[PDB]
A = this chain, B = another copy of it.
Amino acid sequence: FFTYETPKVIVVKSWTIGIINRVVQLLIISYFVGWVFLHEKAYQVRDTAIESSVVTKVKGSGLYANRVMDVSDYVTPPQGTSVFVIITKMIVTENQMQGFCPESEEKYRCVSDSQCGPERLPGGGILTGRCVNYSSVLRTCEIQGWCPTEVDTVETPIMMEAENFTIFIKNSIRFPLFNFEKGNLLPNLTARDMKTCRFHPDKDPFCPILRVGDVVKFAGQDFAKLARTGGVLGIKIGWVCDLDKAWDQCIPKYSFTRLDSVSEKSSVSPGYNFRFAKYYKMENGSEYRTLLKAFGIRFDVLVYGNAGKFNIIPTIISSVAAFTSVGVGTVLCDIILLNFLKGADQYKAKKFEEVNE
């Protein structure tokens, strides 16, 4: 049945409620224009599924254990991904072989073979149950495994030179929704630039060479301590780009932080270290290995971003929401008009028609 309903309406002409209503409407409109559209950029589509690729390479040489250490000695793993370690401190145990020997840590002290049992399984290898002489002063439980066991009585030095190593970060990102590609290596970067650019998160965001010490400082850490305990530093690269502006306005934002925050607050586990071994065998069949306890700084490059570009659909939908919402003022203007205008009684009479039954 083709019939169109529309409500009968009172049309007050008082100047007060006119200005007040037009004012409330102007406030709604201004809120949508200023906050929903400008600040929150509701007029554009957003891409958050950013595709990122990170390739890294470290350079620098250091003196440690009276030997020169280069990238292949101190960076692990070696494949140049977004997570890698620069080893800044080591505890080395040369020429371990499978056999029997006493633990060196005082935590394994024994006077009699009775104390050597399941109560102290952690560390070294498997206990024999015997109690043996580590030195003339100390006696410890005998173990079968890699011998001799490691010793941690005196602290080893750090590789101070590591503060001066360089990290090359080649980062490529793409917002697929807009088919947009950019990286921190601009296409006009020259060999000279690589030789002389000085990275700074504000002054030069497109220099791909970062000094380790600078990264540690930006993260609010003291290299002397971090290199002693080890830790984890995050290099966050953010691509928040407004594709309505120029390609050259899309700029990476570098943040630096320490990620293993629980470590600084903990007396039981203060840094980051791990153990690995170099494996050898003699001309004879038998095997031997060097055990290494490495302390270092773990870097992981975390890439995030979102892009926005003007689109008609969201603009239409959002403006429709604006116009639909401009009406909401009628509840306020109604309270005011019907209850606080000294002419309220007349308006209440004209607006409401009571009914009974």
Contacts and interface: CB of A to CB of B under 8 A. Distances in A.
B259 A6 contact: no
Nearest to A232: B53
Interface stretch (A131-139, A185-193, A216-224): A185-193
Given A170-B262, A232-B53, A6 B351 contact: yes
A10 B8 contact: yes
B354 A259 contact: no
B68 A122 contact: no
Interface residues of A, number: 119
A30 interface: no
Contact of A262 (B10, B85, B185): B185
A26 to B, nearest CB: 12
A9 B352 contact: yes
B83 A81 contact: yes
A76 B79 contact: yes
B53 A260 contact: yes
A330 B6 contact: yes
Given A10-B5, A126-B61, A298 B261 contact: no
Residue among A21, A259, A346 facing the most chain B CB atoms (10 A cut-off): A259
Contacts of A172: 259-263
Contacts of A72: 275-277, 289, 291
Interface in A311-356: 324, 328, 330, 333-334, 337, 343, 346-347, 350-356
Nearest to A16: B2
Contact of A125 (B70, B98, B144, B145): B70
A246 interface: no
A5 B261 CA distance: 61
A115 B4 CA distance: 87
A15 B209 CA distance: 75
A263 B170 contact: yes
A55 interface: yes
A262 B184 CA distance: 8
A57 B17 contact: no
A51 to B, nearest CB: 7
Nearest to A277: B72
Given A353-B9, A356-B13, A170 B18 contact: no
A113 interface: no
A11 B353 contact: yes
Contacts of A91: none
Given A6-B12, A59-B122, 15 more contacts: A4-B17, A4-B21, A5-B10, A8-B353, A10-B353, A11-B353, A13-B354, A51-B259, A53-B232, A55-B260, A61-B145, A67-B98, A68-B146, A70-B145, A170-B269
The 8 closest A-B pairs by CB, nearest first: A2-B18, A183-B262, A53-B259, A68-B145, A78-B276, A72-B277, A172-B262, A4-B17
7 contacts: A7-B10, A8-B10, A59-B123, A70-B125, A81-B83, A191-B268, A283-B283
